[PDB]
Amino acid sequence: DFDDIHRKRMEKDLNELQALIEAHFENRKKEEEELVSLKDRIERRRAERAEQQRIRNEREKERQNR
Amino acid sequence: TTALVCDNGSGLVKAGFAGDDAPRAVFPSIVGRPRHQGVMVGMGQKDSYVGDEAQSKRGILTLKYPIEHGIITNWDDMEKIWHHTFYNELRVAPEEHPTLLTEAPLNPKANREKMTQIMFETFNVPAMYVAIQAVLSLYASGRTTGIVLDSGDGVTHNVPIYEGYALPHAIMRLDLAGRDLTDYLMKILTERGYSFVTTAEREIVRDIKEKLCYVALDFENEMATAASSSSLEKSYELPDGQVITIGNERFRCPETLFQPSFIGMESAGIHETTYNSIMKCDIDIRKDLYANNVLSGGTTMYPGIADRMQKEITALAPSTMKIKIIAPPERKYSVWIGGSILASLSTFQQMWISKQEYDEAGPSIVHRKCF
Amino acid sequence: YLMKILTERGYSFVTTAEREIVRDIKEKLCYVALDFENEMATAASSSSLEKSYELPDGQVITIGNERFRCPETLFQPSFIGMESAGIHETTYNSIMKCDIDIRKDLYANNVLSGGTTMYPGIADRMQKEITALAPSTMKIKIIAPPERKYSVWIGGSILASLSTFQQMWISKQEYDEAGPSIVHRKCF
Amino acid sequence: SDKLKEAETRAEFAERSVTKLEKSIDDLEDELYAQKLKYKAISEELDHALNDMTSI
Amino acid sequence: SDKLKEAETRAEFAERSVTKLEKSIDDLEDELYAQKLKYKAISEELDHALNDMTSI
Ligand SMILES: Nc1ncnc2c1ncn2[C@@H]1O[C@H](COP(=O)(O)OP(=O)(O)O)[C@@H](O)[C@H]1O
Ligand SMILES: [Mg+2]
């Protein structure tokens, strides 16, 4: 007894810390930069949609104005 | 085959196969019948949602715990909980697995006998064994001595053990536990305007207690500080909005543990029943018990309790002895980890209550040599 | 109320037959304003709202700010002298009487039905009002299917077509044994 | 005449509604992107912290 | 008849546009709200970490 405390504690004392650091690094890398880039891409597409909407609205208002 | 280490508890049922690190399925032990009428046809509405399913439909249920203070008050509901645990959370038929239940100290005999009778007749297990909830928590710490304070959610008990020889005359069982703290918190929240009454809102108050409350190192200084500054007021968002702000209710709810006069209980706090439990022991093993005080159970997870308790005991104890409080990070599942370790032992493999033995002596076999 | 406020321009409808004409006017022209005071101010300055309508015999009429004042009575029942609160606040009160744990689901699944909820622009006014009343965190969503008028009957057809429901009918022999008071009994 | 008056009127309502919807859509999307970018800035704060934690 | 046909088709197209826009709005709303809850949770756990640091 009291000799399995080493073999159940020291293991996770380093392996768990290193593995969680690895998980945090990979999750941040996968998540944050890709999300910001994708949001910028969607913003550019949204601006293009806004331009298309403005053009169509203006041309239809020009024709229909009677 | 492998053994099933179930642990009924009172508030959270923890179960899993023997030999692992953590319980496989942990879910509240509540059985809630619906209370309204119900107009949709064919919706597939059941008559009783148990376990973690009734913590999601709790808006239209009346949850009721089947275990009040360690003892079991509603046997049909407890049978339903066990059936759910075996068949849906573990999906292993009990006909092929030994079981290791756990029971608080100083409980009524009839409860234990009915438990074994159910396990042998309804579920028809091969062999079951009942163990005291504190010896397991001592197993999990890897010690062999020490006095363990297992403050669960139903009942707080304090079993001292030396060199493997338990001291039956020094067990101090006190019935203040997490549930009474939930009720007291729900009662002092009314001083700001928030009223929780329904049995469903008791769960919300429990969540508030878990996430916000903490044990003060010194009570009077905290009461004075919270009454002048506002650095303590932490806010919390209800399940529908309308955030609430908890002031000095934060450290007044768990203070009831050290002053049970708050909820009208006469007895002394958990800081003084441990010292009394030690002083009943012999004069030559008091140093070891002082040095190996073990904490377990859910309710001992309050942030800052391992320092308050040490300060209190150091105040009570003689100045020469060293007071050390073992507070492992895996406190909540300490009893179940110990249960897994005990069930995995080879020396223990012949202590099970085999079914043929029960057939020969009846349910009263549990009080006999097979304890 | 529309028939009563039309008299402010000169058009008097009195006969019970002309109530049908006023109903047609209400159906075809009235709409619910998103913001009441701004619309009242706009209709009193410009003339972009005045829509005309041809009676069953000629003599077209022009409806001004009577357009959004008729259906505004729903959100301010004080117009027709009723004390109670509008349909924007009785829904919030009906929610708040429910238990504290099912309020989010009710907030997110508010359903509109019935004919009178077909006014153009009501699904936005009601959402704005409830969002004003409700806590800021909850999401308020208003389900307004295009088949609103017949929603009750479509649901009735679905319910009558169910197999599980086939044994809930009040069979005639049961009525013969317990009288007409059978409806309040188990067969609801 | 009744039919086409109805159709054009409800169509005009549809156009104004849909344009309001488009303004709503753009505002929601841009606000979502701003919030997500704030979150990713927080994530890179945490990632700098994790690089410090590389001390372990 | 010609004006009626053209008006009806324009109306139906705009209507289907309306429905699709509503669906898109709902989905983006669900995702944005999930992000919002994620942010609140991360901030709250961050503050809990700060208070844990205060403790120790
Ligand atoms: N993190 C926590 N902080 C404070 N209290 C907690 C925490 N977790 C659980 N509790 C309290 O402990 C109780 C669970 O105790 P538990 O050890 O599961 O009891 P049992 O011995 O019946 O298993 C809960 O009712 C809750 O009130
Ligand atoms: Mg326990």
From Swiss-Prot, chain B:
It comes from the Eukaryota. SUPFAM superfamilies: Actin-like ATPase domain. The keyword Glycosyltransferase does not apply. Oxidation of Met-40 and Met-43 by MICALs (MICAL1, MICAL2 or MICAL3) to form methionine sulfoxide promotes actin filament depolymerization. MICAL1 and MICAL2 produce the (R)-S-oxide form. The (R)-S-oxide form is reverted by MSRB1 and MSRB2, which promotes actin repolymerization. Its EC number is 3.6.4.-. The modification N6-methyllysine is found at residue 80. Its main location: cytoplasm. The modification Tele-methylhistidine is found at residue 69. One of its GO terms (cellular component) is I band. It is an enzyme of class 3 (hydrolase). One of its GO terms (molecular function) is microfilament motor activity. One of its GO terms (biological process) is skeletal muscle thin filament assembly. It catalyses: ATP + H2O = ADP + phosphate + H(+). The modification Methionine (R)-sulfoxide is found at residues 40, 43. Keywords: Acetylation, ATP-binding, Cytoplasm, Cytoskeleton, Hydrolase, Methylation, Muscle protein, Nucleotide-binding, Oxidation. Belongs to the actin family. PANTHER family: ACTIN. Polymerization of globular actin (G-actin) leads to a structural filament (F-actin) in the form of a two-stranded helix. Each actin can bind to 4 others. In vertebrates 3 main groups of actin isoforms, alpha, beta and gamma have been identified. The alpha actins are found in muscle tissues and are a major constituent of the contractile apparatus. The beta and gamma actins coexist in most cell types as components of the cytoskeleton and as mediators of internal cell motility. This is Actin, alpha cardiac muscle 1.
From Swiss-Prot, chains D, E:
Induction: Induced in stimulated quiescent cells. The modification Phosphotyrosine is found at residue 33. Signal peptide: none annotated. It is found in: Cytoplasm, Cytoskeleton. Phosphorylated at Ser-55 by DAPK1 in response to oxidative stress and this phosphorylation enhances stress fiber formation in endothelial cells. The modification Phosphoserine is found at residues 24, 43, 55. Belongs to the tropomyosin family. The molecule is in a coiled coil structure that is formed by 2 polypeptide chains. The sequence exhibits a prominent seven-residues periodicity. Binds to actin filaments in muscle and non-muscle cells. Plays a central role, in association with the troponin complex, in the calcium dependent regulation of vertebrate striated muscle contraction. Smooth muscle contraction is regulated by interaction with caldesmon. In non-muscle cells is implicated in stabilizing cytoskeleton actin filaments. The sequences of cardiac and skeletal muscles are identical. Homodimer. Heterodimer of an alpha (TPM1, TPM3 or TPM4) and a beta (TPM2) chain. Interacts with HRG (via the HRR domain); the interaction contributes to the antiangiogenic properties of the histidine/proline-rich region (HRR) of HRG. Interacts (via N-terminus) with LMOD2 (via N-terminus) and TMOD1 (via N-terminus). This is Tropomyosin alpha-1 chain. The gene is Tpm1.
